[PDB]
A paper describes a structure:
To further decipher mechanisms of such an intrinsic quality control pathway we analysed here the contribution of three yeast large ribosomal subunit r-proteins rpL2 (uL2), rpL25 (uL23) and rpL34 (eL34) for intermediate nuclear subunit folding steps. Nog1 is part of a range of intermediate nuclear to early cytoplasmic LSU precursor populations and its association with LSU precursors was previously found to be independent of the ongoing expression of rpL2, rpL25 or rpL34. Structure models obtained from single particle cryo-electron microscopy analyses provided evidence for specific and hierarchic effects on the stable positioning and remodelling of large ribosomal subunit domains. The structural analyses performed here provide evidence for strong and specific effects on the yeast LSU precursor folding pathway upon blockage of the assembly of three different LSU r-proteins.
Further single molecule cryo-EM analyses revealed a different folding phenotype for Nog1-TAP associated LSU particles from cells in which expression of rpL2 was shut down. Three particle populations with dominant folding states, designated here as Nog1TAP_L2-A, Nog1TAP_L2-B and Nog1TAP_L2-C could be distinguished after in vivo depletion of rpL2 (see S5 Movie for an animated overview). Finally, the third population of particles depleted of rpL2 was found in an unprecedented folding state Nog1TAP_L2-A. Here, most of the densities of LSU rRNA domains I, III and IV and the ITS2 spacer were missing. On the other hand, LSU rRNA domain VI was clearly detected and the 5S RNP was docked in the premature rotated position on LSU rRNA domains II and V. These were decorated in a similar way with factors and r-proteins as observed in state Nog1TAP-C from the control sample. As rpL2 itself and rpL43, most of its major RNA contact sites, including helix H66 in LSU rRNA domain IV and expansion segment ES31 in LSU rRNA domain V were not traceable in any of these states. In sum, the data indicated that initial positioning of LSU rRNA domain III and the 5S RNP can occur independently of rpL2 assembly. By contrast, 5S RNP remodelling and the arrangement of LSU rRNA domain IV and the 5’ region of domain V 5’ at the subunit interface around the rpL2-rpL43 complex were not detectable. Initial arrangement of the 5S RNP in its premature position was still detected after in vivo depletion of rpL2, although only in a smaller subpopulation of ribosomal particles (~21k particles in Nog1TAP_L2-A of ~98k total ribosomal particles) when compared to the control sample (~147k particles in Nog1TAP-A, Nog1TAP-B and Nog1TAP-C of total ~267k ribosomal particles). This indicates that besides stable assembly of rpL2 and its effects on the positioning of LSU rRNA domains IV and V, additional pathways contribute to enable initial 5S RNP positioning downstream of LSU rRNA domain III assembly.
Author numbering:
A (entry chain r): 197 to 261
B (entry chain x): 2 to 44, 48 to 71, 75 to 83, 87 to 91, 102 to 108, 116 to 515
C (entry chain J): 6 to 174
D (entry chain m): 71 to 139
E (entry chain v): 9 to 254, 260 to 276
F (entry chain D): 10 to 117, 133 to 289
G (entry chain w): 9 to 162, 174 to 201
The structure:
RNA sequence: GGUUGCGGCCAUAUCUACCAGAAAGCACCGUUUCCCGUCCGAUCAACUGUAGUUAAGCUGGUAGAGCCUGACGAGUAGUGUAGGGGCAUACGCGAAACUCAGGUGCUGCAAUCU
RNA sequence: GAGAACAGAAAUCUCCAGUAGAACAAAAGGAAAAGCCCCCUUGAUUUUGAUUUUCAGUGUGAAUACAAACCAUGAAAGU
């Protein structure tokens, strides 16, 4: 996990870095290696948490591509 | 956009201060030097000064009475390839330069809205790079005029995907293996199927191997060898379209087959077995090799490149009669094959188990060397046109270079970020162009194993690329359903 | 000598000004479409005067060009009604001439009340070969003083054909 | 959450040329006990890492032959 | 309306200053030779060159306000006004402006032996390329007047301050020389101004690393006589040398890692 | 009177519709602040019956031309018909590109540098920008001749206005005189008066839709083979040309005669 | 033909501005404007100085990118370029540094108070009874919603809201004018 | 020496009323299958070089308004500079108008001309 | 100015020119546009190299300063 940019519902949680499913967070996507136009390989994209980490021991997110 | 750490005040102070100069006109040091041909010839002792490299290169010319320029290298730990002479007895070596230099391909070009399907294969014509053909998901193959970057007559007749397409070494008849069961023949100007399609094949065609021109007798057209998932290779007569014999030794799909210059068809198969079938043997196996842990995914030979040109060297001058064309093919094959004095077409087999094997089918079945330095399956392995260098592409996002004869590791490229698909070799071996699952095309400088330039523009999934025989232009194709050309 | 100084018709211009905007403007547009066959265009008032009640952008006129061979037929039909004559005036300094009469429906056009009473005015521009110099972009040149058309020359040209007269004497 | 030209937009793209410099620095970087780190830069260490440590682990034999066979 | 705001943004002081704009004002005595000299100077100053509409009757020494007014209204830092009097034949004035206020004034005159660009051999010349400079003689750095002249010439012709230069960009060089050395207290010898085009003769003697540099003179050939001179006060000099201000045991190691020394 | 005094006419090349200084400013007002990279401004002009294409770097001395070509040089490769057509513009662009490539010695000051491909930029001229214009055809031919001018296929023939695609078959046909070849047949099967006044040379030479394409291909091959750019005989040397020309041109009368005539008033 | 150049006094170079200084003795005997050799001597001296500067200049590092033409702001890999060092000559400035800033009362209050600066999240505010974001300001925002809505249940009150907004804008302008005197 | 593409200062270059222009080249023209835009294939987009030209454009020559240049004013007007005295001299920069004389364009690369 | 059915001194329609009393917001010595017409259109985007401020002193959580991409637009230079 790279960072958290925008948590709705009082983004003071964003300042606190809480997951709070529904947040948008940056993830190191270097593994996939997708390259945008111009030859500038991309290695980081913002993703939204899909599952509820509070009620589960794993964190799931979907790339916002 | 990440920023490289800017130079600190110390760096600025160091840069602002002048430093040494490269005029080097005075006080040239002198050290003993020896000459020895890179391949076999050991020798012309001298103790010259730090003279220009051109003078040293011309010194050896009169020694052999050739007038030809030769590439020069020394210390072959040091690994040293005035600037070179100031590093310190240096043992110098020489080898032909192949003065014809392919200019690097850097500039892109507009796309062509041709067949609307994912590209599957492509190959340049041997007689001239101006004409090129691409295969795609669409059942119809199309030729392209590289000069104007426009499509040509459509090869109608196929009803399934054209898995493989490639010009014959003489360029008279193009072969386009169809996915379903058949391979069709198309001359450069037919615009329609030449006679009945080659049928009677139980499974899809995996690869094609044309008969080398240097083995083709005058008048008779070259034979067309085919490989398929059925595990058998059929030898087809281009004239009568009849099959002389079929070998079913391979118990699984034949991954690929190459028609060697000695008349032996080196082919690999999913059964983890390599069978050296030969036409001269009336379709019989002379020897069988079994050393790969996994199955063989690709095959290549040192002399394979010389076969595909069909005597059409970089000049592109077409021959007059079949006899002189065959003679010029044979002389070139001997030149490339007889690099180490004797004619020895080295062979390399690609193993999916992160390993590659070096093979000498003309000698004992003991492997020469076990090239094994990859982390993922090597999709493609191809010998350098010169033959002294071996390169391979793998899904591990890296391209590895190996010695042509001794098998020693040389270097590895890491520019690609995704799985690396098939690659192409420049006509002069100076540059290598590779394509990967990533939507980028890159070319690597063999002289120093460094990234030369990046050639993006493809939408995604650039499956294959090829290099023109003359080196003027480089083609490409991918899943974007758009063919893109590249030139210096 | 007259090697290439032959008078030629450039284009015919037709227009119908209106006392208001709305249904009458659409009627004028339909009249233009049925007469010249050209798509209607909108001519907007440059300013508000309040004397005629027209406000800014009143859309009180429809400028249409009648260039082409059809210009000769329309001009002939119009001149036929007007006693085949034009006044000594109505000719500009360059010789361009025009006119206008009531009840455009008189010259063949149907009497159907959908259009109703609708007059018209005409404006004709004349020039000699080589006018593209002043209309082309590259090498935009001048016009020779002699080459410029004159009132007397255009009057003589209009009198030679169509059997017209000055209407004044 | 409001739609916009935000996320679904590129934000972390690295420069192609800088990758070679980062790899060279990683290969050449060296430190001593008297030198300490205060802020470790965030870079695609995965691309920089995995140098030429050619070992080629054992083949996936199970792929050629399953347990049942 | 945004168009005016964009111009005003450039008018305001910038942390990084662009190329100093130059305004050329023809004086009441703008001789035809003076006009040719102005055209030649503009040829080496384009595209950042501006010429006034017509003649003028402004005396920088006897009237400083008009120059400041013109600089403020045109946002031009460098000002040139050519005017030749009976005593000061072929005199040309150069002025710098700091914050729209007069910075310094120097009178430069060209001898009759000057050769125009058209007189020299025709050669290729690209506008906007930064030329090279060479200063000969210790007086350039060891004298106040010569130092000021050198600084003015550099600011006039140094162009942009880019840190990356193309090899082919070195098209021509400007040779700054003086009419021989002089003893302390002696009259200042005239400054010799020359422009030479560069020719890349092969490196036969110099191996491959460096080619044999060759020069072809294209002009204009000018000898700059020194007349009346004005200099700014020390406070103005200090103000003109301000910096934007843009760490014990703190260093950014390679890869951006923040390392330090324990000692 | 006052208007004539208190005004200044536009530039000499701006009064006439020869050069648009607005484009010149942009092509010369590069900042640049990035590198001292030179430039080579392309020049393409279409006159009556002829096409002129040139590469001219900006220079105060007069923009000395490094290479140039003209349509009237096409007959050197056997092409005479349709000198002003789209195919002729493409051929001229290809010819000029190949000529500059050969004379610059790329293939059959930058010491220690590698092969640097040439770069060129298109010029607006005074032709309205519309897709399919012959200016874009000349640009395409020049690019195909070994030039990497930055360009987009938006204005190439066959471009689809409704959707951002293009048909390469139409472009190939136009390069091989597709429109002209089709119109030849569409006039042969139509009224002959137009096909007898126009295309008279085509009828005389017996050129069909395929012969024209073959001729264009052969001309392109010859252009690739021999761009040597051999000029005319250049007889009638300069001095005698000048002597002959002065016979008709009216020279300025001697001021003495004018003064005498004025006094004779 | 020979490229060797040397002088007794070491030459001073300014690679940041493509300039150099030569404090060597000037030959007054030949530099006289009346002499004919003057031009040749000046040409030779300029050639030597340019040769020295080029020899020193070319010693600098050169960048070699792996990218292509790409966008208009890109750079070609083929074009080798010399990385010049930072400028050394301290040329005089043309304008002063605008370090002065606005001393508005808001900054002092924020410094005194614990109110952190706003994060400028976005223009997309949320509203009700419309099923749309209806951003606060920027396009048909809620500011004009009160005027647009056709029911003002509570003399024309629609114009009163606009008058109040204009008065607030005037108060903001007055505050700007007052702070301009800081 | 003419014409054409790019150009150098941008009125010696323009404007007013006339006359000349062979060869070669612009320009004029003739046409609308298609790319293409306008109400109008007039500008613009495309085709022909054929039909029809010096009538126009453009380049030149004639006599009017300005323009530009050199010297005459002229080291002349003005100005603070130093005390005879309550302005002159001493002493640096330094005009314009006016007068006299001159012209109403030149200039490089490439292509094409009798 | 010549003029153009109603239409005239202000409705429309064509030849010349405002050295450009249009708007170039404008105050000022002053353009094949910066005034009008047809197409697109975000922008309050991203990291963080000088300044502050906490309250788990939180690699910035952030506007200001600026860096280098992204975008529009075009055939391209370009802004």
């Amino acid at each position: 996990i790279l960072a958290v940019k925008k948590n709705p519902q009082s983004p003071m949680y964003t300042q606190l870095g809480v997951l709070t499913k529904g947040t948008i967070i940056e993830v190191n996507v270097s593994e996939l290696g997708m390259v945008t136009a111009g030859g500038k390989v991309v290695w980081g994209k913002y993703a939204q948490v899909t599952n509820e980490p509070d009620r589960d021991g794993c964190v799931n997110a979907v790339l916002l591509v | 956009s990440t920023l490289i750490p800017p130079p600190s005040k110390k760096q600025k102070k160091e840069a602002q201060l002048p430093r040494e100069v490269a005029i080097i006109p005075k006080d040239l040091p002198n050290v003993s030097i020896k000459f020895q041909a890179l391949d076999t010839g050991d020798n012309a002792l001298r103790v010259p000064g730090a003279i220009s490299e051109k003078q040293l290169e011309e010194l050896l010319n009169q020694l052999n009475g050739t007038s030809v320029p030769y590439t020069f290298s020394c210390t072959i730990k040091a690994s040293d390839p005035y600037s070179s002479l100031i590093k310190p007895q240096i043992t110098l070596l020489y080898t032909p330069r192949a003065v014809f230099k392919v200019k690097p391909v850097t500039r892109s070009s507009s796309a062509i809205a041709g067949h609307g399907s994912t590209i599957l294969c492509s190959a340049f014509a041997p007689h001239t790079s101006s004409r090129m053909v691409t295969g795609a998901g669409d059942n119809t193959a199309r030729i392209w005029d590289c000069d104007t970057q426009t499509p040509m007559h459509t090869l109608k007749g196929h009803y399934n995907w054209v898995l493989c397409v490639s010009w014959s070494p003489d360029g008279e008849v193009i072969a386009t293996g169809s996915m379903d069961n058949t391979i069709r023949l198309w001359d450069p100007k037919s615009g329609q199927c030449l006679g009945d399609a080659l049928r009677g094949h139980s499974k899809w065609i995996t690869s094609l191997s044309w008969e080398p021109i240097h083995l083709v007798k005058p008048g008779s057209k070259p034979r067309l060898a085919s490989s398929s998932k059925d595990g058998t290779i059929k030898i087809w007569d281009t004239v009568s379209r009849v099959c002389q014999y079929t070998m079913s030794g391979h118990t699984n799909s034949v991954s690929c087959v190459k028609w060697g210059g000695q008349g032996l068809l080196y082919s690999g198969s999913h059964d983890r077995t390599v069978r050296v079938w030969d036409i001269n043997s009336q379709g019989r196996c002379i020897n069988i090799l079994k050393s790969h842990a996994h199955w063989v995914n690709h095959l290549s030979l040192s002399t394979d490149y010389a076969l595909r040109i069909g005597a059409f060297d970089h000049t592109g001058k077409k021959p007059s009669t079949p006899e002189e064309a065959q003679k010029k093919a044979l002389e070139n094959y001997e030149k490339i094959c007889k690099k180490n004095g004797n004619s020895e077409e080295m062979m390399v087999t690609a193993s999916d188990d992160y390993t590659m094997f070096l093979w000498n089918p003309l000698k004992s079945t003991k492997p020469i060397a076990r090239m094994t330095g990859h982390q993922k399956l090597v999709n493609h392995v191809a010998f350098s046109p010169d033959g002294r260098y071996i390169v391979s592409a793998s899904f591990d996002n890296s391209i590895k270079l190996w010695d042509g004869r001794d098998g020693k590791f040389i270097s590895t490229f890491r520019g690609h970020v995704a799985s690396v698909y098939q690659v192409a070799w420049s006509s002069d071996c100076r540059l290598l162009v590779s394509c990967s699952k990533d939507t980028t095309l890159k070319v690597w400088d063999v002289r120093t194993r460094k990234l030369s330039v990046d050639l993006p523009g493809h939408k995604d999934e650039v499956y294959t690329v090829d290099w023109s025989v003359d080196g003027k232009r480089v083609c490409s194709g991918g899943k974007d359903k758009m063919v893109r050309l590249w030139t210096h | 000598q007259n090697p290439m100084r032959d008078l030629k018709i450039e284009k015919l211009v037709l227009n119908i000004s209106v006392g208001e905007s709305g249904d009458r403007l659409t009627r004028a547009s339909k009249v233009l479409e049925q007469l010249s066959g050209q798509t209607p265009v909108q001519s907007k008032a440059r300013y508000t005067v309040r004397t005629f009640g027209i406000r800014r952008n009143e859309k009180i006129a429809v400028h249409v060009t009648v260039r082409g061979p059809k210009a000769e037929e329309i001009l002939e039909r119009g001149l036929k009604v007007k006693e085949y004559q034009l006044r000594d005036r109505n000719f500009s300094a360059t010789g361009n001439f025009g006119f206008g009469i009531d009840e455009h429906i008189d010259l063949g056009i149907k009497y159907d009340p959908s259009i109703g009473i609708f007059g018209m005015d005409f404006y004709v521009v004349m020039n000699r070969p080589g006018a593209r110099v002043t209309r082309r972009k590259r090498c935009k040149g001048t016009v020779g003083n002699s080459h410029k058309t004159t009132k007397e020359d255009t009057v003589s040209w209009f009198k030679q054909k169509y059997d017209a007269d000055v209407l004044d004497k | 959450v409001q739609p916009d030209r935000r996320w679904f937009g590129n934000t972390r793209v690295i420069s192609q040329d800088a990758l070679q410099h980062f790899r060279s620095a990683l290969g050449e970087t060296q430190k001593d006990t008297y030198q300490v780190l205060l802020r470790r830069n965030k870079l695609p260490m995965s691309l920089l890492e995995e140098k030429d440590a050619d070992e080629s682990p054992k083949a996936r034999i199970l792929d050629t032959e399953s347990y049942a066979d | 309306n945004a168009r005016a705001k964009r111009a005003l943004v450039k008018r305001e002081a910038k942390l990084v200053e662009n190329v100093k704009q130059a305004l050329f004002i023809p004086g009441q005595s703008c001789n035809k030779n003076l006009h040719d000299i102005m055209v030649d100077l503009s040829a080496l100053k384009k595209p950042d060159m501006k010429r006034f509409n017509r003649k003028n009757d402004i005396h920088p020494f006897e009237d400083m306000s008009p120059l400041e007014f013109f600089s403020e209204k045109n946002d031009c830092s460098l000002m040139v006004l050519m005017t030749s009097s009976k005593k000061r034949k072929n005199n040309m004035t150069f002025i710098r402006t700091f914050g729209y206020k007069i910075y310094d004034m120097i009178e430069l005159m060209v001898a009759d032996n000057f050769k125009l660009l058209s007189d020299f051999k025709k050669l290729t010349f690209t506008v906007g390329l930064k030329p090279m400079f060479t200063f000969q003689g210790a007086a350039f750095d060891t004298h106040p007047v010569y130092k000021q002249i050198k600084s003015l010439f550099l600011d006039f012709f140094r162009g942009e301050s880019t840190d990356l230069q193309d090899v082919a960009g070195l098209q021509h060089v400007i040779s700054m020389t003086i009419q021989g050395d002089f003893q302390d207290g002696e009259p200042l010898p005239n400054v010799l101004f020359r422009v030479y085009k560069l020719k890349s003769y092969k490196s036969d003697q110099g191996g491959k690393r460096l080619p044999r540099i060759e020069l072809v003179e294209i002009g204009p050939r000018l000898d700059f006589k020194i007349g009346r001179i004005h200099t700014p006060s020390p406070d103005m000099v200090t103000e003109a040398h301000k910096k934007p201000k843009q760490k014990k045991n703190v260093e950014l190691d390679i890869m951006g890692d923040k390392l330090g020394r324990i000692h | 009177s006052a208007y004539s005094s208190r005004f200044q006419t536009p530039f000499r090349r701006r009064r006439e519709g020869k050069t648009d200084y607005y484009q010149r400013k942009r092509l010369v007002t590069q900042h640049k602040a990035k590198y001292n990279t030179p430039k080579y401004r392309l020049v393409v002009r279409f006159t009556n019956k002829d096409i002129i294409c040139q590469i001219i770097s900006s220079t105060i001395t007069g923009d000395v031309v490094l290479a140039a070509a003209y349509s009237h040089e096409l007959p050197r490769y056997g092409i005479t018909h349709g000198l002003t057509n789209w195919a002729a513009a493409y051929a001229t662009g290809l010819l000029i590109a190949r000529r500059t490539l050969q004379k610059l010695g790329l293939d059959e000051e930058a010491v220690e540098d590698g092969p640097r491909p040439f770069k060129v930029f298109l010029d607006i001229g005074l032709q309205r920008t519309t897709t399919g214009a012959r200016v874009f055809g000349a640009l395409k031919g020049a690019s195909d001749g070994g030039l990497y001018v930055p360009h987009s296929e938006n204005r190439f023939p066959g471009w689809d206005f409704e959707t951002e695609e293009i048909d390469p078959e139409l472009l190939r046909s136009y390069i091989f005189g597709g429109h002209v070849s089709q119109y030849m047949e569409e006039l042969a099967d139509d009224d002959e008066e137009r096909f007898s006044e126009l295309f008279k040379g085509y009828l005389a030479d017996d050129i069909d839709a395929d012969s024209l394409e073959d001729i264009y291909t052969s001309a392109h091959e010859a252009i690739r083979a021999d761009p040597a750019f051999k000029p005319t005989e250049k007889k009638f040397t300069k001095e005698q040309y000048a002597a002959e020309s002065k016979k008709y041109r009216q020279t300025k009368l001697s001021k003495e005669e004018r003064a005498a005539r004025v006094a004779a008033k | 033909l020979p490229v060797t150049v040397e002088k007794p006094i070491p030459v001073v170079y300014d690679l940041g501005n493509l300039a150099a200084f030569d404090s060597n003795v000037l030959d007054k005997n030949d530099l006289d404007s009346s002499n004919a050799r003057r031009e040749e001597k000046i040409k030779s001296l300029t050639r030597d100085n340019v040769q020295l500067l080029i020899n020193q200049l070319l010693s600098l590092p050169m960048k070699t990118t792996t990218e292509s033409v790409g966008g208009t702001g890109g750079q070609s890999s083929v074009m080798t370029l010399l990385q010049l060092p930072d400028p050394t000559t301290d040329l005089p400035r043309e304008k002063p540094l605008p370090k002065a800033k606005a001393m508005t009362k808001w900054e002092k209050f924020a410094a005194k108070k614990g109110i952190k600066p706003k994060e400028r999240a976005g223009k997309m505010i949320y509203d009700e009874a419309s099923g749309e974001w209806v951003p606060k300001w920027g396009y048909k925002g809620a500011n004009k919603k009160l005027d647009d809505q056709w029911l003002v249940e509570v003399i024309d009150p629609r114009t009163l809201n606009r008058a109040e907004r204009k008065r607030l804008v005037k108060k903001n302008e007055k505050q700007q004018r007052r702070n301009m005197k800081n």
